[model samples]
Target: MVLVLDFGSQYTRLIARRLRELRAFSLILPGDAPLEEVLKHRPQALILSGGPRSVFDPDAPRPDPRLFSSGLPLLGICYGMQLLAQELGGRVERAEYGKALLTRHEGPLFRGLEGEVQVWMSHQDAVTAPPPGWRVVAETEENPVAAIASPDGRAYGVQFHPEVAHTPKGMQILENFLELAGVKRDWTPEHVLEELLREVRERAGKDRVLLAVSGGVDSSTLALLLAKAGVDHLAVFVDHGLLRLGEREEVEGALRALGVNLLVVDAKERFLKALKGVEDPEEKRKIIGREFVAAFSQVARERGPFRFLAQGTLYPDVIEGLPEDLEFELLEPFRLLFKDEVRELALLLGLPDTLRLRHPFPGPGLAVRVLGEVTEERLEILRRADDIFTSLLREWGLYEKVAQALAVLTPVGYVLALRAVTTEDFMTADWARLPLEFLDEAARRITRRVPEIGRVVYDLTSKPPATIEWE
Candidate 1:
């Protein structure tokens, strides 16, 4: 088990994902955590993460000073390197953001690496010199200690981040360290499957579990897992009339192929009637939430007593203000997983590639985020616009490049809008600045082909400034 110490870097989770790709079981812990508590877990390796704080700051976060003496194989990057150096009698000096360069790369960490590899560098301070026993394994033009290792190479540090995409061969560099430390790469979705199955059996026992299947990847994958675990389960699909083109039939057909007992409630007319003339996004969400609970409750009563109510709730859903006390009796096998991890698990469970690679769509059926009162005409218009946007993405061979890409009808003017954002966890997002031509094509197709929408626009704003969904 590898332990990644988090210091609040935005990409801290990315580091764990990288390790997971290498089949390493890893967890993240706060940097200032008690050493005894951390050691109790007996992690095989420890990695210090980067942070926003400067090492010289008086109130900066510091890991337990005893970490250096713990004799664990430690690897540090960026702020982590600076912290290690400062704690071990080295000097950290403030430098320009992009001043560091890799002048030397001679160490086990850089084994078999050739040529000047471009790396992502984002730091305002750098290590200027190594401590007494530490040797400079690599150097850049601006900083003397771009990389450092103990004389015995038991510990190492890099001044730049290798977990980010900007770092070429970063995974190889990490793999080199893992090899030297003799850490076995044994983590896999197969392992996760066995563990989850065990969990499902223990918690669910012989009692039945009811899962809300939204025809999305999350619910579909969970339904498959539950079925495989022999936990007599039924998938309840509620068609709220807000689905995209042919979504209901396609999803129901897929579930049938999986051979699971499916109970699809065609609540489209009911939902549409309930949401009639409700233009507020929040009102739409509340209405959908109430209706969903009511529908599920109705099914649960008819299905008799069930042990668990399962949903496809991911980690980001919790992080993004999912109630600290949710009302559901949930059996979330994928709670700990992010989007990509869930995808990998789906593949391991032999789900279809189309379902595994499906883009994200809100469970509210596009009602809440669509801005204005939803009508059949409006739903058709938005669905057509969304279809065009997605079709173009596939045409450009960029369908799987994004986690989610869709059209959002802004409530402001019922304006048709497109949002393409990439996210590891849905708690945060970065808009995909799709090429101008792609936007133009999407706009032309939507405005010309869909008459209800008067205009088309692209959402360039990010999560903080703007949510992907207008609601």
Candidate 2:
């Protein structure tokens, strides 16, 4: 196991994820954390993450002094490197931010490297000299102490970030650290499944479970697992009538084909009625959540008498398990998996490409897609526009290239706006540049065929000024 100290670094989680990707179980701890917390994971190595804080500041995060004497393999990066310089008898000062080429490489940190390597240097601080007993392994014209290693070769530090994609050889640098630290490769697909199954059985026991299948990969996989385990469970698909063309039917047929105990609830009229006269996005979300939960609770009371509700939610945490903040007696089997991983599971389970490859739809369904006062009239309009946009996307072979592709109906002039984005975790997003010809054709088809839409426009703003959903 490896441990990472988060010193208020934006790239903290990225470091932990990269280590896990290398098959080393890694955990992140606060920098000011006590040394005993470090003993809990029994880490084979320690990594220090970069942050914006300057080491010379009054309230900068500091690791426990005892860590230095623990004799564990250590890798310090960016701000991590600067902290080592100041605390361990080295010197540093503010410098310009840019790239650097390694002037030398002699230690295990850069073991297999032969020549100058380009690294991402975002730090304004420069290490004038290495700490006592630590020698400079690399340098550039502006940054003299670009890299350093202890005399014993047990500790290494880099003045650049290796967790970011810009640092082309980032993975290689971290892999070399793993070999040097002897952190064994323990994470694998088979091991994860075996452990997940055991934990689910233990947590579930003999209790009946009610899971909401959203026709998404996460929910689909969990339902399949429960059925495979023969757990007393029922997968419910809520038909809110806000779904795209044939979406509800698709979900029902797929779950049944997998031998899941499936139930389809027709609460379409109720949802449409609840969404009536709601214009604010936040208000619409609140109503949708309360009503959906209430409907599910009512269904469970009459049909299932289920004790637990397992929901399909998407969070790109790469690795999964029950969240630390969750306070309930629930089974979150797919919580340990990401969207891509769940899609892979679908393929292994013989799921059709249509279901596995479907784009993610918002939880509020088309209610959010429609600008305001969701009614039978508005939903039908947005549905037709959305259908034209997505069908053309698949036809043009650009559907699978983006994370989410959506069509929004505006309250103004009853126009339809096209939205497509490329995202990993859906936290920060970039606008997808679809071909203009395709968008024009789809827009023309939508306005001509639907007759409800008067004009068409493409969403230019990303996730900030405008969310993917119009609300």
Candidate 3:
């Protein structure tokens, strides 16, 4: 495994993602973690991540001095390079922070690299000189030690981030480091599916399990996986009334074709009644979560004791839950899988295309994320806006290009707005920022064609500062 030690860099997760893309499994550890604890994992290679602090500062964070003696193939990045340079008889000086040009040199770290690569450089400090037995592998006009490697090609550092999208050939540079470490790429969806299947079977072991089948991709995929395991599973689809155009009929038809035992509970009135006057997104989410859990609990009680509950819990939800911080009593079978991986597994299981690639919809349905109070008039207006949002994406052949998109009727009195976000792992995201023409079309159609809505808006913000869904 490639171990990436995080020094609080905002892009630390990207490093792990890049490794995963290369079919290499990796884990991130806090840089301050004890040296022994880190070494216990027996990682094939180590990557020291960048941070915000200057190496020369007395209170700046630093890795344990013993890491250098571990004889592990090490790759330092940005602040990491500065730390290495300062600790190993080299010098670090402040430089410009942003995008920079990267020129490769003859070294194991840049063995097959070409001339002039553009990379994202986010550092105020840079290595000005190399320590003994260390040679420059690549350099930019802004930094002398843009890339460095030991004379024997075992230790290396890159001042620029190769993990970010700004770095055009960052993956290639990291691939070179992986090659030097003798690490082979092996991770794949097939392997993940097999491993998960074995684990799921072991954990589920002849015990009855209950799962919510919402007709969405995540839940359907989970149900299919459970079905493939031949475990006794019951799928309950709760009709929450906020379903999209022809959703109920489509869900029933699709699940029937799969031949799984499916129970349909028409609870739309119950949901709408519970959601009356709830305008806050958080309140709506809480109400929905509480109601869903209560509904499921009631079903489980009537069905007798179910040993496990299988959720179509995708990775984004898992990461957002921060499994490292939360503890649960029951086993969650699909907690580690990403949306894309789950879809792939669904396809491999020979599930229909509609079920395999269905666009993700929120669990609270359109109730919570739509914002404003629940009413037939409001819902109808929001529905038209949502249809337009999705229809436009489909027209542009971008339906599958996005993970989640919908129309949000802003809290109480506020106008309705369209929101869409693109994500690979769902852990992080960027707003769709649809073209002006598309935005205008949606707004005109929502306000003019759909009479209840007085105005329409587009969400241009991202997930960090603003979530994809507004309450």
Candidate 4:
């Protein structure tokens, strides 16, 4: 097993996920985790993750000091490298920006990489010099000490992110680390799914469990898995009316075809009433979240006060929001997984392409997409325009090209803003450029089909200046 110490880097889980892709099991522990928990897994190696903090800050996250002496092979990245250097008497200079191009990449960490590779660098500081008994192994054009290793051959550090795709051959670097650490590839998707099955059944010993199934892969996949495990469960789908064209019936049909004991609840009118006159994004989310739970709770009362509540809550939810108090034990199997991982599991379950391939939808549904007060009229306009935009993407073989594509409705006209971004995690994103001809047709069809929307525009802004949602 591999242990990745989280330094609040958005990519900490990415490192854990990369290890899983390498067929190795990995766990992410808090940066301030005690040594006791660190040793609990008996990790063959440790990878200290990058973060947003400056190591010079008095209260920055740091690993246990015992880690340096534990005789475990360890690798550090970006902020992690600086933290390690500082712990061992090295100087780190604060930098306003950081990007990396390979200087010399012959170290064990970079053995297979070619020349002139672009590496993604995110750091406020860089190691100016190597720590005692360590030598510089790799350097970016700007930083002289981009990577270093101790003379003892057990510790290594790199200044750029290897988990991200921008770094060419990054996975090879990571695979090399596992080899140097002498850790075997003892884990795979089959083993992982089997383990989850055992744990889910063990925890739910004939106890009734309730799950809310959305059309998205996360929830939909969990529903399929629960049925496969033969757990006593009820999967409920609430039609909130904020969904895309014919989505409710499609999801219901898909789940039923998979032999899932699902109950389709028509709470569209109930949701519309709850969301009447709500314009604020946060407010709509709050209202819809509350109403969604209320609707599910009503069903729970009728079927049973099930001992468990299964949600498709992924890792992004864990990092992105505060937890809501629930009446039952929460079973969020995908809490630690990234988006691509869930998609893989979705295929393993032999789920159809429709549920498996739909882009992420907000928990608030079309409420977030509708800028003003959410009326059925506005929702209708948005839904039709969205269906047009989405179908054209699939028609053009552009559906899976971007992470998310949305059409929002506003007061001006039938407003359509198509957003496609390339990102492994949700923290930072740059817009994906769709073909002008494709957008031209999508826009034309949207206006001609949905008369309520009169205008069509593209969102040129990145994530920093504006959020992904319109409202």
Candidate 5:
């Protein structure tokens, strides 16, 4: 197994996932984790993730000094690379950013890769000289010491992020690192399923499990897994009257057809009533959450005497835990899998294309997307506009190319806005540059079909200054 020392980069999890994608089981720990804490994982190799901090910061995080002499293969990226340079008797100073082209390259890290590689460079610091006996192995057009290697070829540092999708050959660089480190690459799909199923079977036993299906891939796929395991389960779909057009029906059909014992609670009127006259985004979210729990709890008390509460929590959603009031042991089947891995499981389990590859939707549903009061009429308007925009994306073959797409209804401007972005993870994203003709057509169709929308605009902001959602 390989261990990634996370230095708080937005791409930290991306680095870990890249390793897992290479079939090398990997885990992430805080960059400053004590040596003993890291040892508990018995990792064969170590990777230091890039971060937003400068190495010279007085309180910047640093790994234990002992890690250097441990003789384990190590790779440092961006800020991680700066850490190596600053601590190991080398010089680092503020430097360039954005894409850079590798003008020269050598060593095991570059093995099988040919001339002039493109890499993503997003760092404010650069190594001006190599540490003691280490040699510069790669150089980009903008920086002289773009990459460095130790005398023994056991340690490496790159000034760019190899885990980012922007760097097309990023995966190859990571794969080469694993090979050079001799990290085992045996975490195959079969092994993953066998272990996950075993854990579920052991923990769930014959206990009745309660799961919520949001019609998204994660929840629907987990429901399918529970059905496949033949566990006694109740898959509840709560219709809050805020979902996109036909979302609830699509989920019901797909999940029931795939043998998931399903129950859909239609509390739309209750939800709409609670949300009535509330225009604040936070208030809308709170009302939706409270009503959902109240509705789901009513079902639990009335229809379920369940012992376990199963969730479709994936790796990216690992920032939370279970609630005590539920009084049921948490049964999370997809806790260790990423989004794409769950989709793979969905395909293998014969989940329909509709639910298997649908884009992510907010838990608050379209309440937040409406950008103001979530009245039924406004919701209906946004739903139709959103459907048209999303359907156009799919028809233009641009749906799969982007991470997420949505239409936001704004009563303030009496306008509708279309949002589409491409991202490896939602933590950071770039606006998808759809063709002008396509955008024009979508705008034309939305206004023509949904007459209430007087104006249509495309959101051009990325994830930093603005979030993926309007709310």
Candidate 6:
């Protein structure tokens, strides 16, 4: 396995993902983790991930010095490269940043490529000179020491990120490094399933596991996993009356048919009562969250002496806080995996495509989509319009093309804002460019079918300028 030492880079997880995509298993650890702790994984190679901090920062992080002499292959990126150079007796200096053009390139890291290459560069520091016995292997137009290599070719560093999509040939560079490290490329989906099942079984032997089964892919798939592992479990579905049309029924039928021990709790009245007269979006979300926990906790109080609470939390959704009073160990099978990876696991587990490929719904549900007080009547109005827009997307064969699509009902005009985006990671998104004709059809059908909505507006802004959800 390859160990990626994370230095607080947003793209750090992407590095490990790229390695896995190349068929080599990888795990992430804090950059400053002690050598003894790192050794437990028996890592075949090490990758130093990029970070936001400068190498000269007073509190900048560093790796265990012993790793330098450990004889394992190393690849450092951006800030990681600067740290390597500064620690290994090289010179580093602050430099301005932008897209970088590789004026020249060579060596095994750049093998099977030619011509000037454009690479994504985001750093305030650059290695000015190579360490002793190391030579420059690649250079950009602005930085002479863009890349360096050890005398034995066991270590390499690049001043740009090769893990992001902006770097077109990033995967190739990662593959080349893995080839040099000679790490096994046999970590397939089968291996992932086998490992996850073993872990779930070992940890949950004879213990009742409690899971929340939302209609989304992540939670729905987790419900199936707990059942397949043969653990004693109860999967609860709480209907807050904020879900999409037929969502609760879809999730219930699918999980029960797939052998999950399922329970459906109709707490719609409680949620609606708690949310009445609440006009603020943030307030609405808070009420929904508190009500959800209360409802879920009630289920645990009655039907559960559960020892574990399994969540389908993906990489982007980590660090989700729970109420302090809920006493159960967390079992996040998809903690290290991303949304797309979870879909892959769902496929391996025979999850139906309707749930498996469904768009992500907020935990607070349509409460956020309705931009004001979440009354039952308003929720019903939005639901009808939303259903029309969604079904139209599927009929037009455009639903699966976009990552997430939703309708927001603003009380002012009773105007419904249709939002659709295309994104790899939800961190950034571009508004989906649905054809004008499709948008016209969506608006006409929504207004014609749902009489309450007076006008329809398509959100043309991307994520940075505006969030996907109206609230």
Give each model's clash number. Answer: 2, 3, 1, 2, 0, 0
Q: Compared with the true structure, what per-residue lDDT tens digits does model 6 show for residues 126-224?
A: 788899999999888777887899988889999888888777887888888999988888678888888889999999998999989878888888888
Please, what's the RMSD in Å of model 4? 2.9
Q: What alpha-carbon RMSD in Å does predicted model 1 have with respect to the real structure?
A: 3.3
Give candidate 3 misplaced runs (Cα > 4 Å).
57-60, 94-97, 312-329, 410-415, 422-433, 440-449, 462-465
Clashing residue pairs, backbone N/CA/C < 3 A, model 2: 95-124, 320-336, 321-336
Per-candidate alpha-carbon RMSD to the true structure: 3.3, 3.7, 3.9, 2.9, 2.5, 2.5
Models 1 onward score TM values of: 0.89, 0.89, 0.87, 0.91, 0.92, 0.92
TM-score of model number 2: 0.89
Model 6 scores a C-alpha lDDT of 0.86
Q: Give one digit per residue, the lDDT tens place, for model 4 in 46-147.
A: 999988788888778878898777889889988888887988887788833345687777667777788686778765887887898898988777777878
Considering lDDT, where higher is better, how would the candidates rank from best to worst?
Answer: 5, 6, 4, 1, 2, 3
Task: Please report, in order, the local distance difference test score of every candidate based on alpha carbons.
Answer: 0.80, 0.79, 0.76, 0.82, 0.87, 0.86
Q: In model 4, how large is the Cα lDDT of residue 84? A: 79
Residue-pair clash count for candidate 1: 2
Q: Candidate 5: which pairs clash?
A: none
Tens digit per residue, CA lDDT, model 5, 1-471: 888998888788888888888998778899999999998888999999988878887777899998877889999998888888878899998734588889987888988888658899875878998899999998877789989999988889999988887788888899888988888887777777767777777788988999898988888888888888888999999999888888888889878988999999999999999999999999988888999988888888787679999998887777332344557878887877787888887888888787777789998989999877888989989999999999999998999899989988999636999999997654688899999999999999999999999999999999888989989
User: Model 4's lDDT to the true fold?
Assistant: 0.82
Tell me the tens digit of each residue's lDDT in model 2 across 1-471: 888998887778778768867878677888887999987778899999887778777888999988877888888898888878877899888733467777666677887776667788856677898998899987767777888888988888898887776676778889998888777888665666666667667777798888888888778888887776677898888888889978888888988998999989899888878888889889988888877877776667677556666755533343323223323356676654445556766666667888888888777888888877888988888888888888999998999998888888887759888889886433567788888898889888988998878999988878866676666
Residue 28 error, candidate 2, Å: 2.2
Q: What is the lDDT of residue 181 in candidate 1?
A: 69
Span of ten consecutive residues with least summed lDDT in model 6: 315-324
- What TM-score does prediction 1 earn? 0.89
